């Protein structure tokens, strides 16, 4: 911690400054601002840049073994920056998840700009504890100075309140919203993949019918086709216009499959193949639109904007788990819930490591643009 922590901050600073500067350059030149996701990623890069600008202060502070020579105003500003980085990151990740859900399940720049304004104001307003509380504190008569978090008797429950604000308002609600959005995305992708797989089975068996000689192979292919069509009729796209032309189209399709099976069972092969040939008119008339929609939805997964956001959101909330656990334990200790000396020493000796690893996303967010680009 005496030398391990300041080295990681130095690594995060140089790589993050070099990295997050190229992301701004790339987004402003190559991945031009034509979508909401680009705007949100640019704002995320700017927030990371601000935090990395204030990072070397804390790097030096931890290197000198918790002595703060940068002043009082800098002590509160370099803490407001950290709080702002956390809140801006969580808010922008929620906005990105909502944008992905809207773009996938429900296929405006003004809305994005207003949302960015609201996010950069809400993060600053939620970082007010670090502005109205953080100050330099002299440890007793020793010449030691620390960037403490003062609170008077009127401002009671401030440690517990700050911990709860970090846990539920800063982390838990964003995590629940992101999980809901990605669960809805997964449901839509599963429906689309079910439809696409069933129709691929149907088309493969239709091609088998085309290259068939006896009625047995035709009959087996028609059986598989009917099963696939019945399965596909149940894969109704998520959101009468709908639920009445999709199902009617598949009813027509299964009726044609039944006619082909009826012809095949009698021993006729040419008429069965003719009915199988006619089976694609129903596709071109009723089901082609939904097949195109399903392929479009499945095509929004392989783009290199979904994997970047998926990696950024997953890594961020994975790297903040260790710090949220110890922060919650700290609140319990000061609430009097747990008074164990062994556990108390664990929290204090591991909190710097958790807070150091909780801001590695500001370093390796640009790395995702190259690893998944």
């Amino acid at each position: 911690i005496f030398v391990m922590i300041p080295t990681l901050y130095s690594i995060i600073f140089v790589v993050g400054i070099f990295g997050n500067s190229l992301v701004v350059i790339v987004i402003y030149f190559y991945m031009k601002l034509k979508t909401v996701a680009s705007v949100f990623l640019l704002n995320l890069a700017l927030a990371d840049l601000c935090f990395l600008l204030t990072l070397p202060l804390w790097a030096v502070y931890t290197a000198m073994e918790y002595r703060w020579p940068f002043g009082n105003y800098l002590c509160k500003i370099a803490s407001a920056s950290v709080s702002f980085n956390l809140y801006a990151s969580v808010f922008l990740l929620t906005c990105l998840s909502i944008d992905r859900y809207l773009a996938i399940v429900h296929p405006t720049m003004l809305v994005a700009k207003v949302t960015c304004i609201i996010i950069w104001l809400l993060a600053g307003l939620a970082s007010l504890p670090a502005i109205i509380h953080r100050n330099v504190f002299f440890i007793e008569n020793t010449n030691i100075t620390v960037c403490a978090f003062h609170y008077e008797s009127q401002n009671s429950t401030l440690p517990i309140g700050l911990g709860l604000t970090k846990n539920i308002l800063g982390f838990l609600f964003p995590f629940l919203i992101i999980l809901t959005s990605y669960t809805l995305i997964w449901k839509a992708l599963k429906k689309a993949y079910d439809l696409e797989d069933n129709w691929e089975t149907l088309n493969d068996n239709l091609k088998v019918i085309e290259k068939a000689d006896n009625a047995a192979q035709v009959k087996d292919a028609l059986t598989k086709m009917r099963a696939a069509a019945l399965d596909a009729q149940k894969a109704t796209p998520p959101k009468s216009p709908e639920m009445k032309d999709f199902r009617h189209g598949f009813d027509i399709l299964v009726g044609q499959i039944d006619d082909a099976l009826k012809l095949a069972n009698e021993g006729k092969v040419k008429e069965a193949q003719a009915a199988a040939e006619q089976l694609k008119t129903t596709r071109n008339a009723y089901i082609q639109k939904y097949l195109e929609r399903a392929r479009s939805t499945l095509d929004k997964l392989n783009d290199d904007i979904f994997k970047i956001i998926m990696a950024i959101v997953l890594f961020f909330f994975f790297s903040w788990i260790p710090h949220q656990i110890f922060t919650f334990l700290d609140v319990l200790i000061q609430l009097g819930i747990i008074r164990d000396c062994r556990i108390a020493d664990i929290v204090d000796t591991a909190m710097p490591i958790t807070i150091c690893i909780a801001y590695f996303n500001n370093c390796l967010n640009p790395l995702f643009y190259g690893f998944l680009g």
Partner: antibody
Amino acid sequence: EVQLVESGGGLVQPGGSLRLSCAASGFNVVDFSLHWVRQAPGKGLEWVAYISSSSGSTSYADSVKGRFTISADTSKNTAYLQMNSLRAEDTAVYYCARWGYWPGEPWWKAFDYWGQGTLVTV
Amino acid sequence: DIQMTQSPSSLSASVGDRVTITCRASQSVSSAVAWYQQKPGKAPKLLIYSASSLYSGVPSRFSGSRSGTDFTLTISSLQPEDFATYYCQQYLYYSLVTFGQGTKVEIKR
């Protein structure tokens, strides 16, 4: 008041001919496909043959194909089953279920109403 | 020629017990699997017309399910009148009908 009844079951020498009726009520044969399901004594249910009055299409199980013949009469609401060259494996209780027509819920309700069943022995 | 196989040949259970009968299809037959209940000496009775859609007039304790090609029938409260042979039928097409081998649910002593 929907009901399907069977007749024609009895003792017949092997290799003989037997006629099984499925006089129905409460519907018409033109609305449903009348299937014939047998069940050997102390065994499971086995599908035998079916007829679709609307389409005129008849199918038979691979173990009864050719030997058995199934017909229907719209006026009488009867689905006859002509069995010829009966063997020892044809001793069973022959039921006569009904099955709806695609598309819709009547098709998904498979064999919703069964006949009382008739016993034939060789 | 889809083949349906019922795993429990016999199911001895007591009144009030929860019984589950599993029936598996060789191919995919969609949700076109029905469940019956044949008392000894009479015709079967439909219970679940789709894979999991309950029929009308039967008690709501019966409940089916589908997990691909595996179909299960469940009776929550094994009432004294729920002791009979239960068959699974695959009805993907008129000429493709195949029944299960039956699951004689008995009284546990």
